[PDB]
Amino acid sequence: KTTLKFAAFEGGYGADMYKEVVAAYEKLNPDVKIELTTSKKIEDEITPGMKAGNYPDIVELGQGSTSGLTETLLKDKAIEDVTDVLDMKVPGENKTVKDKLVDGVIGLYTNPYGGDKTYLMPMYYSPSGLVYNKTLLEQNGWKMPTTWDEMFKLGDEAKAKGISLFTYPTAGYFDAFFNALLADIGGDQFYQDVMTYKKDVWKTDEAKEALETTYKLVTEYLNPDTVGYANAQDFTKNQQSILDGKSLFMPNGTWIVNEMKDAPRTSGFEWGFAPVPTVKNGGTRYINTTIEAVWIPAKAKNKEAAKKFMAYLYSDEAASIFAKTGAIQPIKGNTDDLASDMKVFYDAYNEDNVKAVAGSFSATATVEGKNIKDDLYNAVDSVASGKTTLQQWQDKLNETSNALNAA
Numbered sequence: 001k002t003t004l005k006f007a008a009f010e011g012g013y014g015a016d017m018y019k020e021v022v023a024a025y026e027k028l029n030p031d032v033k034i035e036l037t038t039s040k041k042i043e044d045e046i047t048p049g050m051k052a053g054n055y056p057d058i059v060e061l062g063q064g065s066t067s068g069l070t071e072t073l074l075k076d077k078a079i080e081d082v083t084d085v086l087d088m089k090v091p092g093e094n095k096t097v098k099d100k101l102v103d104g105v106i107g108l109y110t111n112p113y114g115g116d117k118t119y120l121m122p123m124y125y126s127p128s129g130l131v132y133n134k135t136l137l138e139q140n141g142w143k144m145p146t147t148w149d150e151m152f153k154l155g156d157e158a159k160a161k162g163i164s165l166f167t168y169p170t171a172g173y174f175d176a177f178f179n180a181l182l183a184d185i186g187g188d189q190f191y192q193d194v195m196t197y198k199k200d201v202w203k204t205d206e207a208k209e210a211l212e213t214t215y216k217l218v219t220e221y222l223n224p225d226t227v228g229y230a231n232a233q234d235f236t237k238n239q240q241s242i243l244d245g246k247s248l249f250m251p252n253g254t255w256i257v258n259e260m261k262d263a264p265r266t267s268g269f270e271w272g273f274a275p276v277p278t279v280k281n282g283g284t285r286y287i288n289t290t291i292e293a294v295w296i297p298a299k300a301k302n303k304e305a306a307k308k309f310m311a312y313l314y315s316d317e318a319a320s321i322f323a324k325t326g327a328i329q330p331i332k333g334n335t336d337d338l339a340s341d342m343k344v345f346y347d348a349y350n351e352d353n354v355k356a357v358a359g360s361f362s363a364t365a366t367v368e369g370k371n372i373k374d375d376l377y378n379a380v381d382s383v384a385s386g387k388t389t390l391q392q393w394q395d396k397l398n399e400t401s402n403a404l405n406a407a
């Protein structure tokens, strides 16, 4: 009867998840009609509607997308406050969303403005770090490095066999990379200082070491085809180098299995997962808790019906549908009885001296002509191409961060 418009980003977990979730919600609430749209370019799909005033009612699109639409709408104050959804009952169950959510998932990612208001409800619960061919390392006797000195020495040995040490799909995948690396060096509070634009945080030795370590990685041990493929159309080709054995490591999450399931691979390939190495021996290594976001535009016409469907996305019925391709909703018990192909990822949490890290940059203030994500993530391509020095990389980060601190 009543029509709801839902637009969901199609990623490594696939688009058939939302087709099956929408149909299940329409089975529970037959008076609700959901016009589902899935696309790998959500902004280009819904922009004609937003330009014509026909906004979607609910959008699944986490931060760090290629278009940056979620961050743009947060800057423009165009995303509805959905704090009340936490206290809403999940359709078909006798519990609230806040009761089912895992502890600590509400933070700077879900509350980008820094307060207790939730604007981006957490989607998925994927650990992020480095993925590799477990078989290739074992056949060459190469142990998984825990430090970057072991990492660079491994890159020297791999190049003698025609293998580059490092690659990445797009430069945006350094969000989880730096989240772990910054917490590896400076610690928990230091990472929060970076996300909250603490004064002169990028002039600290901890922040300089994270950039210098990433500098040597992308200027010497990078696959020569990485930058040329670091786009929305060719990012799977950089990931394909891992399956072909031409690259050893790349930063990614649990969606990589279903995303590359039909791709060719070296004989006996097996997915390996590990946290991002730290700098010091025996130091704590962090695993990034990568979540996406579901939200409601401020210009949506059917906000109440979208809130009830958003609460349904945390039901057990929707969780079982999402988990078929590796998408683990951030609800309790969802890491129990995990699929076999997810075990190699979540078992990394059981390693010694390994903690979790989560969050993104604070959207509490905006400065004209400055994006801190471009100066840290997107700048990796310029650094790898040789157009940006280590000092220039650090100076622009400090200038933009301190400018956001004063705003």
Ligand SMILES: CC(=O)N[C@@H]1[C@@H](O[C@@H]2O[C@H](CO)[C@H](O)[C@H](O)[C@H]2O)[C@H](O)[C@@H](CO)O[C@@H]1O
Pocket (backbone or CB within 6 Å): 010, 011, 012, 013, 063, 064, 065, 066, 128, 169, 170, 171, 172, 173, 174, 175, 176, 231, 232, 235, 252, 255, 259, 290
């Ligand atoms: C190129 C692309 O769209 N890849 C998506 C991926 O989005 C990327 O996620 C990483 C996370 O480290 C980073 O934020 C990057 O900027 C994003 O483009 C999705 O996370 C997954 C799962 O939805 O599907 C694709 O791989």
Ligand SMILES: [Ca+2]
Pocket (backbone or CB within 6 Å): 205, 206
């Ligand atoms: Ca120091």
Ligand code: NA
Pocket (backbone or CB within 6 Å): 125, 126, 127, 254, 255, 326, 327, 328, 342
């Ligand atoms: Na997962």
Ligand code: NA
Pocket (backbone or CB within 6 Å): 257, 258, 324, 325, 326, 341
């Ligand atoms: Na999977």
